[PDB]
Design a protein around this nucleic acid. Structure first.
Lengths: 347, 120
RNA sequence: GAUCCUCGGCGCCAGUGAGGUCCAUUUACUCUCGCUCUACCUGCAAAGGUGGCGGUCGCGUGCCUCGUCUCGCGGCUGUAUAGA
Protein backbone atom coordinates (compact mmCIF):
# COMPACT_ATOMS: atom_id res chain seq x y z
CA UNK A 1 0.00 0.00 0.00
CA UNK A 2 2.86 2.36 -0.86
CA UNK A 3 1.58 4.47 -3.78
CA UNK A 4 -1.99 4.51 -2.36
CA UNK A 5 -0.93 7.29 0.06
CA UNK A 6 -0.28 10.97 -0.65
CA UNK A 7 2.95 12.25 0.90
CA UNK A 8 2.70 15.74 -0.65
CA UNK A 9 -0.44 16.63 1.35
CA UNK A 10 0.83 15.70 4.82
CA UNK A 11 -0.90 17.35 7.79
CA UNK A 12 1.75 17.92 10.45
CA UNK A 13 1.78 19.30 13.99
CA UNK A 14 4.74 20.37 16.16
CA UNK A 15 3.85 20.05 19.84
CA UNK A 16 6.48 20.78 22.48
CA UNK A 17 6.65 20.96 26.26
CA UNK A 18 9.01 21.72 29.12
CA UNK A 19 11.34 18.76 29.63
CA UNK A 20 13.31 19.31 26.41
CA UNK A 21 14.93 15.87 26.11
CA UNK A 22 12.36 13.30 24.85
CA UNK A 23 13.54 9.78 24.01
CA UNK A 24 10.94 7.28 22.77
CA UNK A 25 7.30 6.65 21.86
CA UNK A 26 4.61 4.05 22.49
CA UNK A 27 1.28 3.77 20.69
CA UNK A 28 -1.86 2.16 22.10
CA UNK A 29 -4.13 2.64 19.17
CA UNK A 30 -4.87 5.44 19.61
CA UNK A 31 -3.07 6.54 22.81
CA UNK A 32 0.50 7.83 22.67
CA UNK A 33 3.24 7.57 25.30
CA UNK A 34 6.58 9.35 25.69
CA UNK A 35 9.71 9.13 27.81
CA UNK A 36 11.81 12.15 28.74
CA UNK A 37 15.26 12.25 30.36
CA UNK A 38 13.86 14.58 33.02
CA UNK A 39 12.24 11.36 34.23
CA UNK A 40 8.78 11.29 32.66
CA UNK A 41 6.62 8.58 31.10
CA UNK A 42 3.71 10.59 29.71
CA UNK A 43 0.30 9.30 28.65
CA UNK A 44 -0.86 11.80 26.05
CA UNK A 45 -3.97 11.84 23.94
CA UNK A 46 -4.73 12.67 20.31
CA UNK A 47 -7.69 10.76 18.92
CA UNK A 48 -10.24 12.92 17.10
CA UNK A 49 -9.46 14.23 13.61
CA UNK A 50 -12.29 16.67 12.86
CA UNK A 51 -6.68 19.13 19.15
CA UNK A 52 -6.01 17.02 22.27
CA UNK A 53 -2.77 17.35 24.22
CA UNK A 54 -2.14 15.05 27.22
CA UNK A 55 -3.50 13.53 30.41
CA UNK A 56 -1.04 11.96 32.87
CA UNK A 57 2.49 10.77 33.54
CA UNK A 58 4.81 9.01 35.99
CA UNK A 59 8.11 10.07 37.58
CA UNK A 60 11.33 8.12 38.00
CA UNK A 61 12.25 8.40 41.67
CA UNK A 62 15.64 8.72 43.33
CA UNK A 63 14.60 6.17 45.93
CA UNK A 64 17.28 4.49 48.05
CA UNK A 65 15.82 1.04 48.59
CA UNK A 66 16.90 -2.37 47.32
CA UNK A 67 15.15 -5.01 45.15
CA UNK A 68 11.96 -2.96 45.40
CA UNK A 69 9.20 -3.84 42.93
CA UNK A 70 6.86 -0.95 43.77
CA UNK A 71 5.99 2.38 42.12
CA UNK A 72 9.50 3.74 42.75
CA UNK A 73 12.06 3.60 39.98
CA UNK A 74 15.72 4.32 40.48
CA UNK A 75 16.58 6.34 37.37
CA UNK A 76 14.99 7.80 34.24
CA UNK A 77 13.52 5.38 31.66
CA UNK A 78 14.86 5.14 28.13
CA UNK A 79 12.44 3.32 25.82
CA UNK A 80 8.79 2.33 26.19
CA UNK A 81 6.43 0.20 24.13
CA UNK A 82 2.79 -0.54 24.92
CA UNK A 83 0.50 -3.52 24.55
CA UNK A 84 -1.72 -4.42 21.61
CA UNK A 85 -4.73 -4.89 23.88
CA UNK A 86 -4.35 -1.79 26.00
CA UNK A 87 -3.92 -3.47 29.38
CA UNK A 88 -0.17 -3.42 30.15
CA UNK A 89 2.45 -0.70 30.22
CA UNK A 90 6.12 -1.63 30.55
CA UNK A 91 9.36 0.32 30.45
CA UNK A 92 12.99 -0.18 31.36
CA UNK A 93 16.23 1.68 31.43
CA UNK A 94 19.47 2.73 33.12
CA UNK A 95 17.79 2.09 36.44
CA UNK A 96 18.70 -1.41 35.10
CA UNK A 97 15.09 -2.37 35.29
CA UNK A 98 11.64 -2.88 33.84
CA UNK A 99 8.26 -2.11 35.33
CA UNK A 100 4.95 -3.43 34.02
CA UNK A 101 1.55 -2.38 35.34
CA UNK A 102 -1.90 -0.93 34.67
CA UNK A 103 -2.03 1.51 31.76
CA UNK A 104 -5.00 3.50 33.06
CA UNK A 105 -3.97 4.92 36.44
CA UNK A 106 -0.28 4.26 35.58
CA UNK A 107 0.89 2.86 38.96
CA UNK A 108 3.95 0.53 38.72
CA UNK A 109 3.40 -2.90 40.25
CA UNK A 110 6.28 -5.04 38.91
CA UNK A 111 9.94 -4.05 38.56
CA UNK A 112 11.83 -6.82 36.79
CA UNK A 113 15.55 -6.71 37.60
CA UNK A 114 16.84 -9.72 35.64
CA UNK A 115 18.97 -7.59 33.32
CA UNK A 116 22.18 -6.15 34.71
CA UNK A 117 23.36 -3.16 32.67
CA UNK A 118 20.51 -1.13 31.09
CA UNK A 119 17.36 -1.99 29.18
CA UNK A 120 18.09 -0.52 25.76
CA UNK A 121 15.29 -2.04 23.68
CA UNK A 122 11.84 -3.51 24.01
CA UNK A 123 9.29 -5.14 21.70
CA UNK A 124 6.24 -7.41 21.78
CA UNK A 125 4.63 -10.26 19.99
CA UNK A 126 1.38 -9.13 18.36
CA UNK A 127 -1.86 -10.26 19.99
CA UNK A 128 -0.05 -11.85 22.94
CA UNK A 129 1.73 -10.29 25.91
CA UNK A 130 4.93 -12.21 25.23
CA UNK A 131 7.57 -9.55 25.78
CA UNK A 132 11.07 -9.25 24.35
CA UNK A 133 13.47 -7.06 26.33
CA UNK A 134 16.98 -6.55 24.99
CA UNK A 135 19.67 -5.04 27.16
CA UNK A 136 23.14 -3.47 27.40
CA UNK A 137 24.59 -6.64 28.93
CA UNK A 138 24.35 -7.77 25.24
CA UNK A 139 21.47 -10.14 25.90
CA UNK A 140 17.81 -10.52 25.00
CA UNK A 141 15.30 -11.94 27.49
CA UNK A 142 11.73 -13.11 26.85
CA UNK A 143 8.90 -12.58 29.32
CA UNK A 144 5.55 -14.25 29.88
CA UNK A 145 3.49 -11.18 30.67
CA UNK A 146 0.36 -13.33 31.11
CA UNK A 147 1.84 -14.34 34.48
CA UNK A 148 4.44 -11.55 34.45
CA UNK A 149 6.94 -14.35 34.93
CA UNK A 150 10.36 -14.83 33.38
CA UNK A 151 10.87 -17.23 30.51
CA UNK A 152 14.30 -17.44 29.00
CA UNK A 153 17.59 -15.73 28.26
CA UNK A 154 19.27 -15.72 24.86
CA UNK A 155 22.88 -15.15 23.84
CA UNK A 156 24.91 -14.66 20.69
CA UNK A 157 25.47 -10.92 20.65
CA UNK A 158 29.07 -10.03 19.83
CA UNK A 159 28.57 -6.53 21.23
CA UNK A 160 26.28 -4.41 23.44
CA UNK A 161 22.82 -4.79 21.99
CA UNK A 162 20.90 -1.93 20.52
CA UNK A 163 17.35 -2.66 19.29
CA UNK A 164 14.76 -5.38 18.63
CA UNK A 165 11.78 -5.63 16.31
CA UNK A 166 9.34 -8.51 16.52
CA UNK A 167 6.04 -9.56 14.97
CA UNK A 168 3.16 -11.96 15.65
CA UNK A 169 5.37 -15.05 15.42
CA UNK A 170 7.89 -16.12 18.05
CA UNK A 171 10.94 -14.72 16.26
CA UNK A 172 13.10 -11.63 16.57
CA UNK A 173 15.46 -9.44 14.58
CA UNK A 174 17.99 -7.82 16.89
CA UNK A 175 20.94 -5.54 16.19
CA UNK A 176 24.28 -5.49 17.93
CA UNK A 177 25.75 -2.09 18.63
CA UNK A 178 28.98 -1.98 16.64
CA UNK A 179 29.51 -5.56 15.33
CA UNK A 180 27.48 -4.82 12.08
CA UNK A 181 25.27 -7.79 12.87
CA UNK A 182 21.53 -8.20 12.84
CA UNK A 183 20.69 -11.37 14.64
CA UNK A 184 17.58 -13.37 13.84
CA UNK A 185 16.20 -15.18 16.87
CA UNK A 186 14.45 -18.53 16.64
CA UNK A 187 12.98 -18.12 20.11
CA UNK A 188 11.44 -21.57 21.04
CA UNK A 189 14.39 -23.64 19.81
CA UNK A 190 16.72 -20.85 21.13
CA UNK A 191 18.64 -20.71 17.85
CA UNK A 192 19.91 -17.67 15.97
CA UNK A 193 20.46 -16.74 12.34
CA UNK A 194 23.34 -14.31 12.00
CA UNK A 195 23.21 -11.65 9.28
CA UNK A 196 26.33 -9.49 9.25
CA UNK A 197 26.90 -6.53 6.98
CA UNK A 198 30.17 -4.79 6.24
CA UNK A 199 29.04 -2.15 3.76
CA UNK A 200 31.54 -1.66 0.94
CA UNK A 201 32.05 8.10 2.27
CA UNK A 202 32.20 6.13 5.52
CA UNK A 203 31.85 2.41 6.09
CA UNK A 204 29.50 0.92 8.66
CA UNK A 205 30.80 1.80 12.09
CA UNK A 206 27.73 0.85 14.06
CA UNK A 207 24.30 -0.30 12.94
CA UNK A 208 21.72 1.79 14.71
CA UNK A 209 18.07 0.96 14.07
CA UNK A 210 16.03 -2.04 12.95
CA UNK A 211 12.54 -2.69 11.55
CA UNK A 212 10.75 -5.87 10.40
CA UNK A 213 8.50 -5.38 7.41
CA UNK A 214 7.15 -8.96 7.54
CA UNK A 215 8.14 -12.51 8.52
CA UNK A 216 10.40 -12.94 5.48
CA UNK A 217 12.74 -9.93 5.39
CA UNK A 218 13.69 -6.81 7.34
CA UNK A 219 15.64 -3.55 7.24
CA UNK A 220 18.54 -2.23 9.34
CA UNK A 221 20.07 1.22 9.43
CA UNK A 222 23.76 1.89 9.94
CA UNK A 223 25.56 5.07 10.98
CA UNK A 224 27.24 5.56 7.59
CA UNK A 225 23.95 6.40 5.90
CA UNK A 226 23.53 2.85 4.61
CA UNK A 227 20.01 1.45 4.81
CA UNK A 228 19.83 -2.26 4.10
CA UNK A 229 17.12 -4.84 3.54
CA UNK A 230 17.91 -8.46 4.41
CA UNK A 231 16.07 -11.60 3.35
CA UNK A 232 15.90 -14.37 5.94
CA UNK A 233 16.51 -16.70 2.97
CA UNK A 234 19.95 -15.32 2.21
CA UNK A 235 23.04 -14.23 4.14
CA UNK A 236 23.89 -11.33 1.80
CA UNK A 237 21.97 -8.02 1.90
CA UNK A 238 18.77 -7.83 -0.10
CA UNK A 239 19.64 -4.17 -0.75
CA UNK A 240 22.02 -1.47 0.50
CA UNK A 241 21.37 2.20 -0.29
CA UNK A 242 24.00 4.79 0.59
CA UNK A 243 24.03 8.24 2.23
CA UNK A 244 20.45 8.05 3.47
CA UNK A 245 20.39 11.55 4.98
CA UNK A 246 23.08 13.50 3.10
CA UNK A 247 26.45 14.69 4.29
CA UNK A 248 27.05 17.16 7.14
CA UNK A 249 36.16 15.75 4.85
CA UNK A 250 32.35 15.75 5.46
CA UNK A 251 30.72 12.50 6.51
CA UNK A 252 27.36 10.80 5.92
CA UNK A 253 24.91 11.51 8.73
CA UNK A 254 23.71 8.31 10.34
CA UNK A 255 20.19 7.00 10.70
CA UNK A 256 18.80 7.65 14.17
CA UNK A 257 15.23 6.45 13.62
CA UNK A 258 13.70 3.59 11.67
CA UNK A 259 10.28 1.99 11.95
CA UNK A 260 8.22 0.44 9.19
CA UNK A 261 4.62 -0.59 8.81
CA UNK A 262 4.13 -4.35 9.40
CA UNK A 263 2.97 -6.42 6.42
CA UNK A 264 3.40 -3.32 4.27
CA UNK A 265 6.22 -1.66 2.33
CA UNK A 266 6.43 1.72 4.09
CA UNK A 267 9.78 2.60 5.68
CA UNK A 268 10.07 5.46 8.20
CA UNK A 269 13.65 6.71 8.64
CA UNK A 270 14.90 9.95 10.20
CA UNK A 271 18.14 11.54 11.38
CA UNK A 272 19.52 14.92 12.48
CA UNK A 273 19.11 16.28 8.95
CA UNK A 274 15.69 17.53 10.05
CA UNK A 275 13.72 15.86 7.26
CA UNK A 276 11.85 12.61 7.76
CA UNK A 277 12.64 10.13 5.02
CA UNK A 278 10.03 7.60 3.92
CA UNK A 279 11.12 4.74 1.67
CA UNK A 280 9.15 2.05 -0.10
CA UNK A 281 9.87 -1.53 -1.00
CA UNK A 282 9.86 -1.89 -4.78
CA UNK A 283 7.49 -3.81 -7.04
CA UNK A 284 10.08 -6.59 -7.43
CA UNK A 285 10.11 -6.79 -3.56
CA UNK A 286 13.90 -7.04 -3.85
CA UNK A 287 15.04 -3.44 -4.36
CA UNK A 288 14.19 -0.02 -2.98
CA UNK A 289 13.19 3.30 -4.55
CA UNK A 290 12.41 6.71 -3.08
CA UNK A 291 8.81 7.37 -2.11
CA UNK A 292 10.38 10.48 -0.84
CA UNK A 293 11.25 13.14 1.70
CA UNK A 294 8.80 14.70 4.13
CA UNK A 295 11.05 18.44 11.64
CA UNK A 296 13.78 20.33 13.51
CA UNK A 297 15.92 18.51 16.02
CA UNK A 298 17.47 15.06 15.91
CA UNK A 299 14.81 12.36 15.58
CA UNK A 300 15.16 9.70 18.25
CA UNK A 301 12.02 7.61 17.82
CA UNK A 302 8.97 7.37 15.60
CA UNK A 303 5.64 5.58 15.64
CA UNK A 304 2.82 4.16 13.52
CA UNK A 305 -0.93 4.40 13.02
CA UNK A 306 -3.51 3.64 10.32
CA UNK A 307 -6.99 4.76 9.34
CA UNK A 308 -7.73 1.09 10.01
CA UNK A 309 -11.48 1.16 9.30
CA UNK A 310 -13.35 -0.26 6.29
CA UNK A 311 -11.66 2.53 4.30
CA UNK A 312 -7.99 2.29 5.46
CA UNK A 313 -6.95 5.55 3.77
CA UNK A 314 -4.38 7.87 5.34
CA UNK A 315 -1.79 7.04 8.00
CA UNK A 316 -0.85 8.97 11.13
CA UNK A 317 2.74 9.00 12.40
CA UNK A 318 4.59 10.98 15.10
CA UNK A 319 8.32 11.69 15.39
CA UNK A 320 9.61 12.31 18.90
CA UNK A 321 12.86 14.19 18.16
CA UNK A 322 14.59 15.76 21.17
CA UNK A 323 17.88 17.73 21.32
CA UNK A 324 20.32 14.85 21.95
CA UNK A 325 20.51 11.23 20.94
CA UNK A 326 18.42 8.77 22.81
CA UNK A 327 20.70 6.88 25.23
CA UNK A 328 23.75 9.10 25.42
CA UNK A 329 24.34 12.75 24.64
CA UNK A 330 27.31 12.35 22.25
CA UNK A 331 25.88 15.14 20.09
CA UNK A 332 24.02 18.17 21.43
CA UNK A 333 21.92 20.58 19.40
CA UNK A 334 19.99 23.72 20.25
CA UNK A 335 17.22 22.62 17.87
CA UNK A 336 14.27 20.46 18.90
CA UNK A 337 12.65 20.03 22.31
CA UNK A 338 10.49 17.47 23.99
CA UNK A 339 8.36 17.48 20.89
CA UNK A 340 6.00 15.49 18.73
CA UNK A 341 5.63 16.14 15.03
CA UNK A 342 2.45 14.26 14.19
CA UNK A 343 2.26 14.22 10.42
CA UNK A 344 -0.70 12.47 8.82
CA UNK A 345 -0.61 11.11 5.28
CA UNK A 346 -4.00 11.43 3.52
CA UNK A 347 -5.62 9.11 0.94
CA UNK B 1 47.57 19.58 10.37
CA UNK B 2 46.18 16.03 10.23
CA UNK B 3 49.00 14.56 8.16
CA UNK B 4 48.58 11.05 9.77
CA UNK B 5 44.98 10.88 8.57
CA UNK B 6 43.56 7.37 8.86
CA UNK B 7 41.61 6.09 5.87
CA UNK B 8 37.90 5.24 6.17
CA UNK B 9 38.44 1.93 4.26
CA UNK B 10 38.50 -0.14 7.50
CA UNK B 11 41.70 1.19 9.05
CA UNK B 12 39.53 3.65 10.96
CA UNK B 13 37.24 0.70 11.69
CA UNK B 14 40.06 -1.46 13.05
CA UNK B 15 41.27 1.53 15.10
CA UNK B 16 37.85 2.12 16.67
CA UNK B 17 37.31 -1.62 17.17
CA UNK B 18 40.61 -1.93 19.02
CA UNK B 19 39.58 1.17 21.01
CA UNK B 20 36.43 -0.70 22.03
CA UNK B 21 38.26 -3.90 22.96
CA UNK B 22 40.83 -1.97 25.01
CA UNK B 23 37.87 -0.26 26.67
CA UNK B 24 36.61 -3.70 27.62
CA UNK B 25 40.06 -4.66 28.94
CA UNK B 26 40.39 -1.33 30.86
CA UNK B 27 43.60 -0.42 28.98
CA UNK B 28 42.12 2.84 27.80
CA UNK B 29 42.83 6.41 28.86
CA UNK B 30 40.07 8.61 27.45
CA UNK B 31 40.05 12.32 26.72
CA UNK B 32 42.85 14.72 25.85
CA UNK B 33 44.07 15.41 29.39
CA UNK B 34 44.25 11.77 30.46
CA UNK B 35 45.78 10.89 27.09
CA UNK B 36 48.39 13.58 27.76
CA UNK B 37 49.07 12.09 31.20
CA UNK B 38 49.52 8.64 29.70
CA UNK B 39 51.93 9.89 27.03
CA UNK B 40 53.94 12.07 29.45
CA UNK B 41 54.11 9.17 31.89
CA UNK B 42 55.06 6.88 29.01
CA UNK B 43 52.45 4.20 29.68
CA UNK B 44 50.94 4.73 26.23
CA UNK B 45 51.29 2.09 23.54
CA UNK B 46 49.26 3.83 20.82
CA UNK B 47 47.25 7.04 20.56
CA UNK B 48 44.35 8.08 18.31
CA UNK B 49 43.04 11.62 17.98
CA UNK B 50 39.94 13.04 16.32
CA UNK B 51 40.15 15.40 13.35
CA UNK B 52 36.49 16.38 13.81
CA UNK B 53 37.61 18.69 16.62
CA UNK B 54 35.99 22.07 16.18
CA UNK B 55 39.18 23.88 17.10
CA UNK B 56 41.85 21.23 16.35
CA UNK B 57 44.50 23.25 18.22
CA UNK B 58 43.17 21.79 21.48
CA UNK B 59 44.49 18.36 20.46
CA UNK B 60 47.47 19.53 18.39
CA UNK B 61 49.66 19.50 21.51
CA UNK B 62 49.98 15.72 22.00
CA UNK B 63 51.76 14.92 18.65
CA UNK B 64 54.71 16.86 20.13
CA UNK B 65 55.04 14.70 23.23
CA UNK B 66 54.20 11.60 21.20
CA UNK B 67 57.13 12.46 18.95
CA UNK B 68 59.23 12.89 22.10
CA UNK B 69 58.13 9.60 23.68
CA UNK B 70 58.15 7.91 20.22
CA UNK B 71 54.64 6.49 20.36
CA UNK B 72 52.48 6.24 17.22
CA UNK B 73 49.54 8.61 16.83
CA UNK B 74 46.86 8.68 14.15
CA UNK B 75 43.68 10.70 13.58
CA UNK B 76 40.19 9.31 12.97
CA UNK B 77 37.74 11.78 11.41
CA UNK B 78 34.98 11.67 14.04
CA UNK B 79 35.06 12.40 17.76
CA UNK B 80 31.54 10.98 18.03
CA UNK B 81 32.67 7.68 16.49
CA UNK B 82 35.61 7.72 18.87
CA UNK B 83 33.25 8.64 21.71
CA UNK B 84 30.87 5.72 21.35
CA UNK B 85 33.82 3.60 20.27
CA UNK B 86 34.95 4.16 23.84
CA UNK B 87 31.45 3.86 25.27
CA UNK B 88 31.27 7.18 27.07
CA UNK B 89 27.98 8.87 25.96
CA UNK B 90 30.02 12.02 25.26
CA UNK B 91 32.47 12.91 22.50
CA UNK B 92 35.97 11.61 23.19
CA UNK B 93 38.40 13.86 21.37
CA UNK B 94 41.66 11.91 21.76
CA UNK B 95 42.25 8.49 23.21
CA UNK B 96 45.34 6.64 24.34
CA UNK B 97 45.60 2.91 24.81
CA UNK B 98 48.30 1.18 26.82
CA UNK B 99 49.38 -2.43 27.17
CA UNK B 100 50.65 -5.04 29.61
CA UNK B 101 53.13 -7.91 29.53
CA UNK B 102 50.90 -10.64 28.03
CA UNK B 103 47.62 -10.09 26.18
CA UNK B 104 46.16 -10.78 22.74
CA UNK B 105 45.16 -7.11 22.98
CA UNK B 106 48.90 -6.29 23.14
CA UNK B 107 49.32 -8.34 19.96
CA UNK B 108 46.53 -6.29 18.33
CA UNK B 109 48.26 -3.07 19.44
CA UNK B 110 51.48 -4.37 17.87
CA UNK B 111 49.87 -5.11 14.49
CA UNK B 112 47.87 -1.88 14.67
CA UNK B 113 50.87 0.43 15.14
CA UNK B 114 52.55 -1.62 12.46
CA UNK B 115 49.80 -0.26 10.19
CA UNK B 116 50.23 3.22 11.70
CA UNK B 117 53.95 2.92 10.91
CA UNK B 118 52.89 2.11 7.34
CA UNK B 119 51.14 5.49 7.36
CA UNK B 120 53.89 7.59 8.97
C1' G C 1 78.11 43.32 53.79
C1' A C 2 76.57 40.15 58.71
C1' U C 3 72.78 35.35 58.04
C1' C C 4 69.57 32.68 61.05
C1' C C 5 66.14 32.45 65.09
C1' U C 6 62.40 35.02 68.16
C1' C C 7 58.57 38.69 68.59
C1' G C 8 55.11 42.08 65.50
C1' G C 9 51.82 44.00 61.82
C1' C C 10 49.89 43.55 56.79
C1' G C 11 47.94 40.20 53.38
C1' C C 12 46.82 34.08 52.15
C1' C C 13 46.52 28.28 51.75
C1' A C 14 48.86 15.33 45.46
C1' G C 15 46.44 11.94 42.68
C1' U C 16 42.15 9.74 40.35
C1' G C 17 38.79 9.35 36.19
C1' A C 18 32.33 8.87 35.19
C1' G C 19 29.37 10.27 37.25
C1' G C 20 26.28 14.43 38.92
C1' U C 21 21.37 18.38 40.08
C1' C C 22 15.59 18.87 41.85
C1' C C 23 11.40 16.16 43.97
C1' A C 24 3.08 13.39 45.45
C1' U C 25 1.22 14.32 39.52
C1' U C 26 2.66 20.17 38.85
C1' U C 27 2.31 22.32 33.80
C1' A C 28 8.54 27.83 31.74
C1' C C 29 8.82 31.93 29.12
C1' U C 30 7.41 35.33 25.53
C1' C C 31 4.69 36.67 21.02
C1' U C 32 0.32 36.32 17.75
C1' C C 33 -4.51 34.17 16.18
C1' G C 34 -9.90 31.98 17.90
C1' C C 35 -13.04 32.64 22.03
C1' U C 36 -20.25 29.56 23.58
C1' C C 37 -24.19 32.94 25.29
C1' U C 38 -27.21 37.52 24.33
C1' A C 39 -30.31 41.66 26.17
C1' C C 40 -33.42 44.30 30.27
C1' C C 41 -31.70 45.32 34.23
C1' U C 42 -31.54 45.46 41.04
C1' G C 43 -26.98 47.86 37.89
C1' C C 44 -20.61 53.50 38.61
C1' A C 45 -17.37 49.29 38.30
C1' A C 46 -18.60 44.03 39.91
C1' A C 47 -22.23 40.56 41.68
C1' G C 48 -27.79 38.46 41.49
C1' G C 49 -33.77 38.31 39.33
C1' U C 50 -35.86 37.89 34.28
C1' G C 51 -36.49 37.53 28.91
C1' G C 52 -34.55 36.03 23.01
C1' C C 53 -31.23 31.45 20.85
C1' G C 54 -31.48 27.49 23.93
C1' G C 55 -30.91 22.42 26.16
C1' U C 56 -33.38 18.31 29.09
C1' C C 57 -37.84 15.80 31.29
C1' G C 58 -44.09 16.01 32.04
C1' C C 59 -48.14 16.84 28.93
C1' G C 60 -51.44 18.56 24.18
C1' U C 61 -50.58 16.60 20.24
C1' G C 62 -50.16 19.14 15.11
C1' C C 63 -48.49 14.65 10.87
C1' C C 64 -52.41 14.11 3.00
C1' U C 65 -46.46 9.94 6.39
C1' C C 66 -50.05 9.88 13.06
C1' G C 67 -42.84 7.01 13.68
C1' U C 68 -39.83 11.70 11.60
C1' C C 69 -40.39 16.70 10.81
C1' U C 70 -43.61 22.80 11.88
C1' C C 71 -44.75 23.81 17.56
C1' G C 72 -46.20 25.21 22.78
C1' C C 73 -46.66 25.47 28.04
C1' G C 74 -45.35 23.50 32.85
C1' G C 75 -40.33 21.30 37.14
C1' C C 76 -34.65 23.22 35.70
C1' U C 77 -30.24 25.70 33.74
C1' G C 78 -26.79 26.43 29.40
C1' U C 79 -21.57 22.78 26.58
C1' A C 80 -19.37 23.57 21.39
C1' U C 81 -14.08 21.23 17.31
C1' A C 82 -13.11 23.69 20.91
C1' G C 83 -8.13 25.90 21.59
C1' A C 84 -4.23 26.67 17.24
Amino acid sequence: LASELAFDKATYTQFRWNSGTVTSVAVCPPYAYTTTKDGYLTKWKLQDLPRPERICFAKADARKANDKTYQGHLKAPLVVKASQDGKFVVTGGADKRLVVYNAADLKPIKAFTQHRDAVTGLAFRRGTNQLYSCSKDRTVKVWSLDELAYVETLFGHQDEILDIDALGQERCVSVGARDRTARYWKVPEESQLVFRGGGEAAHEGSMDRVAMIDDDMFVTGSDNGDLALWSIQRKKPLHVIARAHGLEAPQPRGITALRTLPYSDLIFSGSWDGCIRVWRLSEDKRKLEAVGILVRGIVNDIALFERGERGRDGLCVVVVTGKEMRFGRWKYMKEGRCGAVIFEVPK
Amino acid sequence: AAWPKAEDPALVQELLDCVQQASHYRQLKKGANETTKSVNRGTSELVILAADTQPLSIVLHIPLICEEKNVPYVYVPSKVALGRACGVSRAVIAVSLTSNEASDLNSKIRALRDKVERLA
